[PDB]
Amino acid sequence: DIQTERAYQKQPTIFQNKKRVKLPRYYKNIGLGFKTPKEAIEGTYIDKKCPFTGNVSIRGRILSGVVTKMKMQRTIVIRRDYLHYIRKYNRFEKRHKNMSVHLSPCFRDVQIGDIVTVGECRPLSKTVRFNVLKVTKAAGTKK
Amino acid sequence: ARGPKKHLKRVAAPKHWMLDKLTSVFAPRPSTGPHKLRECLPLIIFLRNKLKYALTGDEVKKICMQRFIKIDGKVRADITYPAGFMDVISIDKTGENFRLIYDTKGRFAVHRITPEEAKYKLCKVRKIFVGTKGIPHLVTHDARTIRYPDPLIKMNDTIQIDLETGKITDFIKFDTGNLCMVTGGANLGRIGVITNRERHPGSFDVVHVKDANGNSFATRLSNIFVIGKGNKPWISLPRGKGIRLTIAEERDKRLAAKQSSG
Amino acid sequence: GISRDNWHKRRKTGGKRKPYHKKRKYELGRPAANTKIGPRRIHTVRVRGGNKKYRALRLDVGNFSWGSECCTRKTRIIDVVYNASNNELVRTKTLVKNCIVLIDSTPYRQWYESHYALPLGRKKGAKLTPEEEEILNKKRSKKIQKKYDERKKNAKISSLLEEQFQQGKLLACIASRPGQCGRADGYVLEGKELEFYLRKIKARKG
RNA sequence: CGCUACUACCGAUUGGAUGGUUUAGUGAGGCCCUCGGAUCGGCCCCGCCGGGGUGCCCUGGCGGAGCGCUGA
RNA sequence: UAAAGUUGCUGCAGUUAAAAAGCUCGUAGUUGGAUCUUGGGAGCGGCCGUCCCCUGCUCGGCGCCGGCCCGAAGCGUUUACUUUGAAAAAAUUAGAGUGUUCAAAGCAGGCCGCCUGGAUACCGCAGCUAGGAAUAAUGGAAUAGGACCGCGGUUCUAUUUUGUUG
RNA sequence: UACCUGGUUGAUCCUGCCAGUAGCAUAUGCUUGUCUCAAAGAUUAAGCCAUGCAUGUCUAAGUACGCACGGCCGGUACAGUGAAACUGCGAAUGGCUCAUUAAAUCAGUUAUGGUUCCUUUGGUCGCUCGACUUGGAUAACUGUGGUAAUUCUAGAGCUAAUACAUGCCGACGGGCGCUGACCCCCUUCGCGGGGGGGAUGCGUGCAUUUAUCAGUGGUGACUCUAGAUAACCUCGGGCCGAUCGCACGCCCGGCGGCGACGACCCAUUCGAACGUCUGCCCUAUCAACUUUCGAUGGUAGUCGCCGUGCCUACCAUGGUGACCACGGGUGACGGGGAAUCAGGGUUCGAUUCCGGAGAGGGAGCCUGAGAAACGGCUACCACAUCCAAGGAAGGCAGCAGGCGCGCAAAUU
RNA sequence: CAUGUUGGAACAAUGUAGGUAAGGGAAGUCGGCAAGCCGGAUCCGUAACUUCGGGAUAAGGAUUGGCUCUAAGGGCUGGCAG
């Protein structure tokens, strides 16, 4: 189910050796008014880098982007698309700066083309400095 | 650049000293102290250019090393000591007391006061702290860490303290309708009443401040310093009383000054 | 020396970086401690900001906490059993953080004797002839014996810990960093975490 | 096509000369680790007896080790 | 560098002066028809010219007696656009004052101890913020896994309450 | 000031360049009376340097027994000066140059809830049952010496401290959490029972670890700040004052003022350091690049001041690119700015302000809060000095000045 | 099976058949003839030219013993146990 790894996956807040005659969870609210999902409270997953169940503090820039690649382990590549202005030719030009965001498994059902609102935190890895705070799927919704 | 810098170039000095560039390359880099390098007067600048007791820098050496100047009732003998906002400078021999209060333009005014007015000063709380054994501490804007302050004196309030003891004499809470002075930004050294503080979670909060002539300017919460209640302040105010009369209206008074008194 | 810089290596795109400055000091690497289990040897490092950092090269006696019964005792470290990171840190018996060890069992059995007035270990029929320890299992009042008779109902130990008291050595997990602190502080394994590390020990051996 | 003047081109020469990065080999010096032990001090029970409590003994003028243990 | 409208966004040329691929398909790129609260009122300016509207359920009163509403605050399709504010080192430039004897300058000076300056703008974009909703993108109900309801149950944890004591 | 003129022809109208025209900032030619500002070895050679200087420092307040001076005549040690010299702070600022470096540097904007910080400033400096000054060297000195030579140091003989060490009177009488001889009391038919008093021994205040009773205060949000209990306290140790001189007064061997110096820690100030968003010149005769010897992620450590493939073991197969990746060039340090401009642009920015980098090329480190420091060391590599041939010594892209190089740039 | 159709004793020259040589290293010679160097495997790296198949084991590098360990790769019985 969980703990397929070499070391025991647990949370460093809870203690899970109570004496007898359903272990509890460590959740938190992220701040700036974001609804912490049901999957991060009723869920069983252990994740170090999750901003609901794990240890990370969201502070600084809240950005948005559209999901591109989902082939990594608990990480996704989003695309930010913007228009750079040139003063000489009084027009714009399409650019993009696609970035690597950490995705918590409290977002259980995500596909490509979804719009994720991501928050700045400390560097998680070499090129990961953002966490998905909410997922807002595009047009369609059903088939 | 492998350690802390010790010189200050006269060109790259804070703008509100008014230091003429043709004199020297360097300006008085203020000694580390209770206030920041940008937003403070060093002692030499106040005692040389503003008062003209000293013609040179060796003369503020000869003044300070006879120890007549006492900053906040404490005898300071360092020519580059950073005297910031609301810090009261006292010359004991002359019998003159000067409070450092911001001008209409955003400069430090040569504002004289009574000896009664000298014994107390106002300090904005920067944070509260819980000490080593549930001792509430309280750090001000001049690094004053007062211990056992009143449980109602919170984060952004203002405390009137006595200088002899260093205890809290009285306090003012951050109320909408209290007087305040903007101590930074574009609106530097204007007195007005608070109408609303815009709550932006994460980023800085902005306060809308209305002066007596009926003019609404906004600023960050970092620069606002509450100084009294309603219409009357707790401190002596300088000439003008931080109205900020506009460049056309200044020429309208400068006309009448040299036309009437001639 | 050993650089800890992030600019000596490639970009995200996969292009070779150019160095704009050479090795700075605040980019600093010291060689590892590799803290073996032996008679206590600790060196000190003068670090950035003139602070200390204690390089435990050997330490034999740690300080482990029985989180369930709540008693922390300065206990002897004996043998290393598991290491999640490197299998060659169990062959060369080193002490790093989150490393599973066998600690002495007698300072916890002593406390369980004193606090509850029960035995732990003690084989079928194996009773005490010199008579020192067994004077702790008898002779209370008829009303402070009644104090102890509240503790005895909520006494019974976990049956997976029963064996680690009879063998005389407890599976413990180090929590501090012997390289940095000059200490081997940890906690005794019980519950699901114990069962997990018991399987991973037992899995290979056979 | 024949004379002169100048500028580029192909060209056998397994051409030549300067750099730049770098594979191998050897590898100075510093740093860490395990040692090491040139040396320099403690301390002890005896011997000649002081000096003072009554042979115990508080400190010393000295010779001597099993260099006894111990520090740098 | 200007003259160079002889490198062109403003702003050039391509029948013959130099120049349109031999033809069509075609992916990025670029660009994309029309369509959705408009009139009319309403008091006061002097037949006409402004204000306000086709929005809602923690906290004070001008209060009446499970309540008849206005005052401060958590809130309400997304973005570009424009408007204002914040925040933005001086120096330089633009500029205000001032007879360095004029000027370029500089930050000083003026009146018989006093008075008085040492302003002010500009500071592309990117981020922050609050108005405006035309223009241009974008969202919603069509296997109804629809909006508004008041209803009837399935389970968990606080407190308003069980005289102390479980 | 939103501008044009000459030249293809026998002559004409065009396209189109060439040539004139004005500014600017380098060189140079000829010429020169006054006065006021004033750039100046950047371009080529981040080429080489003889000589001199450029970083030293004491008040009443760490340490004076130099008679080098000196007041006193005989004072219970010490008047005042005083070279040294040891202590402890500075030398990591400044100054110079632009060699490298193209999302790097740097600019605006934000994060440190992810760290460190000498000093300044303000707190705390009898909260911990638990000694009227304690050890023994060592410099200057004295007296002996070695080498041609260095800001070389040896052997011997003294003596100091805020250097190096060691340590306790006081507060001190207790208070508080386990452990428990026995004590107050009846209930019921004696056992069960409902609450208190206590002879003890132990543990005692801020760092490492784990726990819950919890969560006094705060945050947009903490595994926050505090509070409680069980242990640990690194011989290469967290403090818990053997320091100094101004006036010295109270009281019958105690009390007391005014300041230096010093101190673990907290909060400041100066910062620094790593990260967030967006932004750059030419090039396709550079179209795919990265990854076994980390490339992009996961996990658990190591190391670091801290976050992180920074590094190591296991895994996963990712990461970037026509919206120009990757590779290459640049007479490329970046920006504030500068020249020219109707309006839009074009070109320049080594150059006094901010940030960066380097000290002939690389590499490594000692000390310190802070250098990977070069007016500090340790090696190699070029260049080069004195030599009695054994050995020492050196880093002007600091201020002057000399050589070279040049179209090109100042007084030892 | 009895050393190839015989034994014994010596250890001269010159032979035939093996080997090794300091320093140099083709100067020897018609001519590197003869001899010598290289050699297996595993991991790197691989040019001109090309009939695009090759060239190619191009050229050029590194490692290799013994011992004690770890890791991964399978079947039978009613995501697990034996």
* Domain region containing C120: 106-168
Helices C159-166, C192-204: crossing angle, 10 deg rounding: 60
The whole-angstrom separation of Cα B204 and Cα B185 is 13
Same domain membership, residue C175 and residue C78: yes
CATH number at residue C140: 1.10.168.20
The whole-angstrom separation of Cα A132 and Cα A117 is 6
**Chain-centre distance for alpha carbon B32:** 17
Among positive and negative, which fits the CA dihedral B181, B184, B185, B188? positive
Q: Which residues of B15-44 are buried (b: 16+ CB within 10 A; e: fewer)?
A: ebbebeeeeeeebbebeebbbeeebbbbbb
Q: Please name the residue of chain C whose CA is at the shortest distance from the CA of residue A11.
A: C193
Distance, CA of A1 to C1' of F382, in Å: 67
Chain B residues 32-61 within 7 Å (CB) of strand E: 49-50
* Domain region containing A26: 1-142
Residues in CB range of B193: below 8 A, 6 or more apart:
B177, B178, B179, B180, B209, B210, B230
The whole-angstrom separation of Cα B163 and Cα B64 is 20
Residues in CB range of C156: below 8 A, 6 or more apart:
none
Same domain membership, residue C98 and residue C37: yes
The whole-angstrom separation of Cα C82 and Cα C171 is 10
Q: Please name the residue of chain A whose CA is at the shortest distance from the CA of residue B203.
A: A60
Same domain membership, residue C133 and residue C71: no
Nearest to C84 among A6, A15, A126 (CB): A6
Cβ of C204 near strand G (distance < 7 A): yes
Same domain membership, residue C100 and residue C5: no
Same domain membership, residue C202 and residue C137: no
Tokens of A109: 């059902």
The whole-angstrom separation of Cα B122 and Cα B141 is 10
Residue B57, classed as helix, strand or coil, is helix
One-letter amino acid at C129 equals: T
The whole-angstrom separation of Cα B240 and Cα B99 is 16
Question: Would the CB atoms of A59 and B201 count as touching at under 8 Å?
Answer: no
Experimental method: cryo-EM
Within B57-203, residue ranges assigned H as helices are 57-64, 115-118
Same domain membership, residue C136 and residue C72: no
Closest approach of A62 to chain C, Cα-based (Å):
22
Among positive and negative, which fits the CA dihedral B117, B120, B124, B126? positive
Which class for B52: exposed (0-12), middle (13-18), buried (19 or more C-beta within 10 A)? exposed
**Does CATH place domain B1-116 in 3.10.290.10?**
yes
Question: Would the CB atoms of A19 and C68 count as touching at under 8 Å?
Answer: yes
One fold for B1-116 and B121-171: no
For C197, other C-beta atoms within 10 Å of its C-beta total 19
Nearest to C98 among A7, A15, A16 (CB): A7
Cβ of C31 near strand D (distance < 7 A): yes
CATH number at residue A93: 2.40.50.1000
Percentages helix, strand, coil for chain B (3-state, rounded to 5) are: 15, 30, 55
What 8-state DSSP symbol labels residue A19? P
- Structure resolution, Å: 3.2
- Tell which strand E nucleotides have any atom below 7 Å from a protein Cβ: 9, 29-30, 72-75, 80, 85-91, 96, 106-108, 115-116, 118-120, 124-130, 138-141, 145
Count of domains forming chain A: 1
| Residue A32 contacts B, CB cutoff 8 Å | yes
Residues 98-117 of A with CB under 8 A from C: 100
Question: Would the CB atoms of B202 and A31 count as touching at under 8 Å?
Answer: yes
Cβ of C1 near strand D (distance < 7 A): yes
Distance, CA of A56 to C1' of E95, in Å: 53
The whole-angstrom separation of Cα A84 and Cα A65 is 17
CATH number of B174-244: 2.30.30.30
Which of the residues C13, C151, C161, C200 would you substitute to probe the A interface, choosing the one with the greatest number of A C-beta atoms within 10 Å?
C200
Among positive and negative, which fits the CA dihedral B243, B246, B247, B249? negative
Same domain membership, residue C84 and residue C35: yes
Q: Which residues of C116-132 are buried (b: 16+ CB within 10 A; e: fewer)?
A: bbbbbbeeeeeeeeeee
Question: Would the CB atoms of A19 and C154 count as touching at under 8 Å?
Answer: yes
CATH number belonging to the domain at B121-171, selected among 3.30.2350.10, 3.30.420.610, 2.50.20.10, 2.40.50.740: 2.40.50.740
Distance, CA of A140 to C1' of F368, in Å: 66
CB A7 within 8 A of CB C98: yes
